[PDB]
Design a protein around this ligand. Structure first.
Ligand SMILES: *[C@@H]1O[C@H](CO)[C@@H](O[C@@H]2O[C@H](CO)[C@@H](O)[C@H](O)[C@H]2NC(C)=O)[C@H](O)[C@H]1NC(C)=O
Ligand SMILES: *[C@@H]1O[C@H](CO)[C@@H](O[C@@H]2O[C@H](CO)[C@@H](O)[C@H](O)[C@H]2NC(C)=O)[C@H](O)[C@H]1NC(C)=O
Ligand SMILES: *[C@@H]1O[C@H](CO)[C@@H](O[C@@H]2O[C@H](CO)[C@@H](O)[C@H](O)[C@H]2NC(C)=O)[C@H](O)[C@H]1NC(C)=O
Ligand SMILES: *[C@@H]1O[C@H](CO)[C@@H](O[C@@H]2O[C@H](CO)[C@@H](O)[C@H](O)[C@H]2NC(C)=O)[C@H](O)[C@H]1NC(C)=O
Ligand SMILES: Cn1c(=O)c2c(nc(N3CCC[C@@H](N)C3)n2Cc2ccccc2Br)n(C)c1=O
Ligand SMILES: Cn1c(=O)c2c(nc(N3CCC[C@@H](N)C3)n2Cc2ccccc2Br)n(C)c1=O
Ligand SMILES: Cn1c(=O)c2c(nc(N3CCC[C@@H](N)C3)n2Cc2ccccc2Br)n(C)c1=O
Ligand SMILES: Cn1c(=O)c2c(nc(N3CCC[C@@H](N)C3)n2Cc2ccccc2Br)n(C)c1=O
Ligand SMILES: *[C@@H]1O[C@H](CO)[C@@H](O)[C@H](O)[C@H]1NC(C)=O
Ligand SMILES: *[C@@H]1O[C@H](CO)[C@@H](O)[C@H](O)[C@H]1NC(C)=O
Ligand SMILES: *[C@@H]1O[C@H](CO)[C@@H](O)[C@H](O)[C@H]1NC(C)=O
Ligand SMILES: *[C@@H]1O[C@H](CO)[C@@H](O)[C@H](O)[C@H]1NC(C)=O
Ligand SMILES: *[C@@H]1O[C@H](CO)[C@@H](O)[C@H](O)[C@H]1NC(C)=O
Ligand SMILES: *[C@@H]1O[C@H](CO)[C@@H](O)[C@H](O)[C@H]1NC(C)=O
Ligand SMILES: *[C@@H]1O[C@H](CO)[C@@H](O)[C@H](O)[C@H]1NC(C)=O
Ligand SMILES: *[C@@H]1O[C@H](CO)[C@@H](O)[C@H](O)[C@H]1NC(C)=O
Lengths: 727, 727
């Protein structure tokens, strides 16, 4: 039998199918099948053609994305996709009238449109062009300019700046329409005082001189972008009328210093919830503002303010959890840490300070999925006490004792990791099972919890993998300093416990990380285990997520310590097992995992023979302010300079003399600048350490271009085989 | 016995001693011995202390350089050395009065002085500060501002811009005092329209954001710096007076288009020789200008103009040869190509077009060293028909048949490569022997040609090398396409002809290159041959220098062709010898040698297993205009775009699949931009080719910082040993 090869992984010969749908009502959803947009009815099972694939072929361009207006009268077509950062992109847009089956030719959406969104009702459009907001009440009508402040690299209206995109919102959008489209709320980011990150972009071979990319990027302790939040009354939008807008300022408790807007949630047409966090990120406030009909003001009240603090570390996981409001908006449900340090759902009253915990246990709620008048639906890792598992649960709002696991025992051996998507009134839901077995996509009714149908079962993939010697993924526990921690091992086929196998540690180990889960993956590790007979292990120690604040906050204000030390002690234990060759142990990782790899290799433990660090952080002062300060505080002698100073990979340069090290980085990395790797290599050169490098010209943080992706894993495979004396 | 190791090479444990002297009269010279400046008298042999080392210790700073005024009244001390490019640097200067044995405290030379020079007589000073010229008639007196146009990165007065330093002058200075210091001639370089090369400089680890270095650098075909040449009358220099200056424009034949000033030679106080070259560099003209006493003008005449044209390639070797004038200035001697294509000395009359060749033969004159009323002294490779040898010859100006070789038979086995330094009236000369044996420095009288003394014989080095198994350097000839070409081989100790040794080719192969010579070197090749038992060979084929224009101009308008092809055919012949392992042949080079190594590896010959390219050119359109256009012309479809297009390393990317390739480059390289290796790696990634890289952070073209230098050779040694299966 054949094995899962490098070619198999790189050329994606074994395809994992999925089922992406867009709920457009309480019982209907849109699905793209063979480039046709089909409208499926969950209530009866039947489907109809919403838009024929023949309309796509006549557009004159490839349709990578579509958006149907909520009233189903128009469709937005995305073409000329020009990717910027992780979520940002500029594109050209066409509006197709579904009523008259014609394409809008007059007053079109301009070229280089940064972001575009329909109103939640009707067919109003709000788009961002040249860092300014424009509103089209009708797709054939002229757009109305909302903002005049927009300036390239300086002022951003309706779109995030670099750091808000990467670390705060995890989205390029900073526009929020009110439920009935009366109001268009937006954030304004001012990057005037933010220093620029500059690096060379070489472009195509024909470009004689390289260009200098300049991005306002705040590094740890640097000047941060400022934010302003406005609510525009779209009703007064007329060509010869001024823009009616009200600026909502944060509460005094956060307004006294540097802050961030971390969340926006429309409650009703006349009530908006704003979530602000201080720059320290151990203090968060929810300010619920009400519209005054007589003045047009959005008034805040002390009674409507909800504080969330952390004394042991930071607020939330990567940000405070979002409030989930009732239809009336008089109460909300939010994930907060309890007295025991576990992240659970608390029920809050909009005008009262006290909350009531509706969930409890030595496990955590991942997210609130849906909320009806009677039920709340959520994802948690409660099942079998596995933090690497995910299941859908429903809690009765009048009786918190009545909790049902909707997904737990559907396919207990095949399915332990779930995600869910609910219909408009949470009447139906799609369940997404990601592993340990082949991913399974199913549809359910919320009333009966009956499985209506199997949307995708990956049967084509099952047939393909029968002819291949696939590796086995084993999940287990080990005890480190009296605490039980989880590990996983991708084991080679025909695994013999008497034989001694080489071991490769795959690491992330970042604050709130989870490398150990039940997700099915056709990864590079699959190839290493299947073809090269390498055990690929991962471990979640101190600082990892979804196991309580005690474990998560263990690395507070001391990144590069416990999580690094735990990777070494876990490997020492793995090597004690008689099936591991102690002479052939390697460690590798990307981003935070590249930093951990490097801090592990610089620890001088003697455990690891070699390691591969891909685009790693080398010194926390070089990384962005939002992420870094959340865990480290400020790099001032008054705050945490000392722990910033002794957590650099450079300070461990001398120990690298005992290992084989491969350092990889993309030159056009906007996130973890090439500077990080360039400063690390320099220190190793100064320490007299031999190591290997690999720069990837014009590649960003992902090193995800088709040719670069293939090259990096082929390079990493050669290095590992050299290190493990493998042909 | 011990071998010459990597540590021996890198830490320079075996020191090659030299003897540096400064002729300050026709019979006297200055020598720095144990930080004492001793004044030696060649006429009698005796020496005296000119400046005690006790004066250096009280200065308060390290004296890296000293300059005595021609009248021996003052001494200039260089401290705070801040290196810029290949020859450029900014430093702080102190003047010490040798008469009153005091230091100058008032009206001092400013900090960040770019260049400083004494007048050829007396003690006048001309210095460059903030791109402007200042003159001090007296070291205690205030300086007089000469130029007002100086602007950082834009206007350069008295100092070269990037390209004039690197490619035209091979010096930072663009100031020329007249023999008796009446006039101060200078060039002004205008870089307004020159595009900038931008690259990141990371600096010390503490620097949070990298800085962007911006240098006006003209790439092949880009807008070039403009040049203005002025002669300032220093006599009218007064604080309340304007500067008296005359701008000398090039002759009409050069002035019609883009040109360069390539040489400045003062003939008399009232006669200056300017050498101009067209941008094409196949047309040069010497314009001899005479001072008009009644008007202050520098008048040129058609009769005083001397044109040098090349139809087969470029003028001169890297620039047209400099004219060597008689004391009267009515005639001059210059190296030009003869009817046979060989560089020989031609005698010209200042007001006549015709010249008379004073030398002849199938060999070349390297340079005119000294000129008296009766004799001309020159260096040539005539001896034993070896183009890699250098000897001092003297020719009688009244009888060109009377030629004496002054150095040929001094030490015929030890000394075949010579350089010379003559006294003010060529009454005495120092002879510098560089190999094949240990370097030997000697003093000689021009009248008797008697060796007065042995300055340095490297006897300490001889004693050290006796206990070390040193490799042997063999020089020989091979026939390629009917032409005899020279090669050299560093052979391992106890060389066994039955044993098959791995072979390393060390290449330069650039236009006018000479890798094959009789110079003694304690190089990386010494270690590879001595410790690792690797034969290190070099070869000079088509395009190489000092063997006539036929061989040199062979690669005109076709770089990457013949010189690459000849490196392959020479290696094929070397491998035919039964002492070379054909399975283990490698090739390596720096700059043009890196370009050649990359072209050889991409040729798909099957001869080479591996190769190392250090800071190579990858595409000629990325390299500067002066060097590139000299051999390639312009990259326009009207000129040589087609040969620019097919001479990139990138076009040969697919063939690299058959070889092991190591690509090295410094990130802060001003000469061959990192862009070149960044564009090369990108093409190899796009071709799906595996290779190895190594970037050197903040390192420039030399990769000459103590730590980087050690790291590079240690890294290349590991790569070579891996390639040759050596422990
Ligand atoms: C346009 O739509 C048709 C369906 O009307 C697509 O045809 C299906 O294609 C898949 C994949 O090749 C087949 O498995 C089905 O059997 C086909 N169905 C029918 C009814 O023929 C067609 O592929 C689409 N074309 C494009 C270019 O997207
Ligand atoms: C930075 O310095 C601190 C303080 O010296 C280090 O913390 C100590 O680490 C040792 C193990 O090496 C423990 O035994 C101590 O209990 C730790 N002390 C404290 C106060 O926590 C820390 O390891 C260093 N950080 C890095 C990244 O090396
Ligand atoms: C350096 O060169 C620039 C041209 O590149 C000269 O600038 C021009 O000067 C004339 C006359 O003053 C103006 O009409 C042009 O508009 C200028 N052009 C540009 C591009 O600036 C400049 O004078 C030169 N400087 C020196 C000191 O020689
Ligand atoms: C660029 O293309 C020309 C195409 O003619 C190459 O020139 C030929 O080189 C081969 C070498 O084996 C000779 O046999 C031909 O006679 C040459 N032709 C001409 C017209 O000169 C040239 O070598 C290519 N350059 C590179 C760098 O590969
Ligand atoms: C809120 N808001 C605005 O509504 C706004 C604005 N700048 C303008 N102008 C656009 C350029 C032409 C200029 N005549 C008006 N307006 C629109 C406007 C204002 C008042 C009365 C009628 C109108 Br129409 N700025 C800067 C702003 O902040
Ligand atoms: C390995 N690895 C990561 O290192 C990792 C990650 N998610 C995050 N973060 C949360 C989202 C915003 C992101 N800036 C931080 N990180 C950390 C990180 C990412 C990229 C660059 C530097 C760092 Br430090 N995931 C999912 C993962 O797999
Ligand atoms: C040659 N040459 C100059 O000599 C020169 C100059 N600009 C100045 N000055 C600078 C500031 C003082 C002002 N008098 C003009 N000068 C000096 C000067 C001029 C005329 C009369 C007396 C003097 Br003192 N330029 C531009 C130039 O080219
Ligand atoms: C290997 N090797 C060289 O490649 C070499 C060289 N001398 C020269 N030149 C003459 C001086 C000006 C210089 N720009 C060209 N070069 C070519 C070159 C140098 C640096 C960057 C790119 C190139 Br193309 N020597 C002495 C040597 O040894
Ligand atoms: C499904 O069938 C019902 C039958 O009553 C019909 O009303 C509905 O429109 C159909 N849906 C689709 C998507 O065709
Ligand atoms: C952006 O901030 C600067 C201060 O850093 C301020 O002067 C400017 O007016 C601000 N612009 C806007 C549109 O808020
Ligand atoms: C708006 O003003 C323009 C002139 O500036 C005028 O042409 C147009 O008719 C006005 N629109 C309305 C709705 O009155
Ligand atoms: C939040 O962090 C700051 C800075 O470390 C600290 O002074 C403050 O007391 C912290 N607040 C809480 C609630 O822990
Ligand atoms: C200074 O010169 C004396 C000889 O006059 C010598 O003995 C001494 O070593 C020298 N010192 C230094 C620091 O060069
Ligand atoms: C060398 O000796 C001669 C003897 O006549 C003397 O005049 C001269 O000054 C001496 N030179 C030096 C440099 O000591
Ligand atoms: C030069 O001019 C200054 C005034 O600008 C004056 O003080 C000085 O005396 C003048 N020098 C001469 C030599 O006249
Ligand atoms: C000099 O070079 C240019 C450009 O390559 C060319 O057009 C011209 O004919 C050449 N002239 C001579 C004399 O070779």
């Amino acid at each position: 039998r054949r094995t899962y090869t490098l070619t198999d992984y790189l050329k994606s010969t074994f395809r994992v199918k999925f089922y992406t749908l867009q709920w457009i009502s309480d019982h209907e959803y849109l699905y793209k099948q063979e480039n046709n947009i089909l409208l499926f009815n969950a209530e009866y099972g039947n489907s109809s053609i919403f838009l024929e694939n023949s309309t796509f072929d006549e557009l004159g361009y490839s349709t990578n994305d579509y958006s149907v207006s909520p009233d189903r009268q128009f469709i937005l077509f995305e073409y000329n996709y020009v990717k910027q950062w992780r979520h940002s992109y500029t594109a050209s847009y066409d509006i197709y009238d579904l009523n008259k089956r014609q394409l809008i030719t007059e007053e079109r959406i301009p070229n280089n449109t940064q972001w575009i969104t329909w109103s939640p009702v009707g067919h109003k459009l709000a788009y961002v062009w040249n860092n300014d907001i424009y509103v089209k009440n009708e797709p054939n009508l002229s757009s109305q300019r909302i903002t005049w402040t927009g300036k390239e690299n300086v002022i951003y209206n309706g779109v995030t700046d670099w750091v808000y995109e990467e670390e705060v919102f995890s989205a390029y959008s900073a526009l929020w329409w009110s439920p009935n489209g009366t109001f268009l709320a937006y954030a304004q980011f001012n990057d005037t005082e933010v220093p620029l990150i500059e690096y060379s972009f070489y472009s195509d071979e024909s470009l004689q001189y390289p260009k200098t990319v300049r991005i306002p990027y705040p590094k740890a302790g640097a000047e941060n972008p400022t934010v302003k939040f406005f609510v525009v009354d779209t009703r007064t939008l007329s060509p010869n009328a001024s823009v009616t807008s009200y600026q909502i300022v944060p509460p005094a408790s956060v307004l006294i210093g540097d802050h961030y807007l971390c969340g926006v949630t429309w409650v009703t047409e006349e009530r908006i919830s704003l979530q602000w966090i201080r720059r320290a990120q151990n203090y968060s406030i929810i300010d619920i503002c009400d519209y005054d009909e007589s003045t047009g003001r959005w008034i805040s009240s002390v009674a409507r303010q909800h504080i969330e603090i952390s004394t042991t570390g930071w607020v939330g996981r990567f940000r405070p959890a979002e409030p989930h409001f009732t239809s009336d908006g008089n109460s909300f449900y939010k994930i907060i840490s309890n007295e025991e340090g576990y992240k659970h759902i608390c029920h809050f009253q909009t005008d009262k300070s006290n909350c009531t915990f509706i969930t409890k246990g030595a496990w955590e709620v991942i997210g609130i999925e849906a909320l009806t008048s009677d039920y709340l639906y959520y994802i948690s890792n409660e099942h079998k006490g596995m933090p690497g598992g995910r299941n859908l649960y429903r809690i009765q709002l009048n009786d918190y004792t009545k909790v049902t696991c909707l997904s737990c025992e559907l396919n207990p051996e095949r399915c332990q990791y779930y995600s869910a998507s609910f219909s408009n009134k949470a009447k139906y839901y799609q369940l997404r099972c990601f592993g340990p077995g082949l991913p399974l996509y199913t549809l359910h009714s919320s009333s009966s919890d009956k499985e209506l149908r199997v949307l995708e079962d990956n049967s084509a993939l099952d047939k393909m993998l029968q002819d291949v010697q696939m590796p086995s993924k084993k999940l287990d526990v080990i005890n480190l300093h009296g605490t039980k921690f989880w590990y996983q091992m991708i084991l080679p086929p025909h695994f013999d416990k008497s034989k001694k196998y080489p071991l490769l540690i795959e690491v992330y180990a970042g604050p709130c990380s989870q490398k150990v889960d039940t997700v099915f993956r056709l990864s590079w590790a699959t190839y290493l285990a299947s073809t090269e007979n390498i055990i690929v292990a991962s471990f979640d120690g101190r600082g990892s997520g979804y196991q309580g604040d005690k474990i998560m906050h263990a690395i507070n204000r001391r990144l590069g310590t416990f999580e690094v030390e735990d990777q070494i002690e876990a490997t020492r234990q793995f090597s004690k097992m008689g099936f591991v060759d102690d002479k052939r142990i390697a460690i590798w990782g990307w981003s935070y995992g590249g930093y951990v790899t490097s801090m592990v290799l610089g620890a001088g433990s003697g455990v690891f023979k070699c390691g591969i660090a891909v685009a790693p952080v080398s010194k926390w002062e070089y990384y962005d302010s939002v992420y870094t300060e959340r865990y480290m505080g400020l790099p001032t002698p008054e705050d945490n300079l000392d722990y910033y100073r002794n957590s650099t990979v450079m300070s461990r340069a001398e120990n690298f003399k005992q290992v084989e090290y491969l350092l990889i980085h993309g030159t056009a990395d906007d996130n973890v600048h090439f500077q990080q790797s360039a400063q690390l290599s320099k220190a190793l050169v100064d320490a007299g350490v031999d190591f290997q490098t690999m720069w990837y010209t014009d590649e960003d943080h992902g090193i995800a271009s088709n040719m670069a992706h293939q090259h990096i894993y082929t390079h990493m495979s050669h290095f590992l085989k050299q290190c493990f004396s493998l042909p």
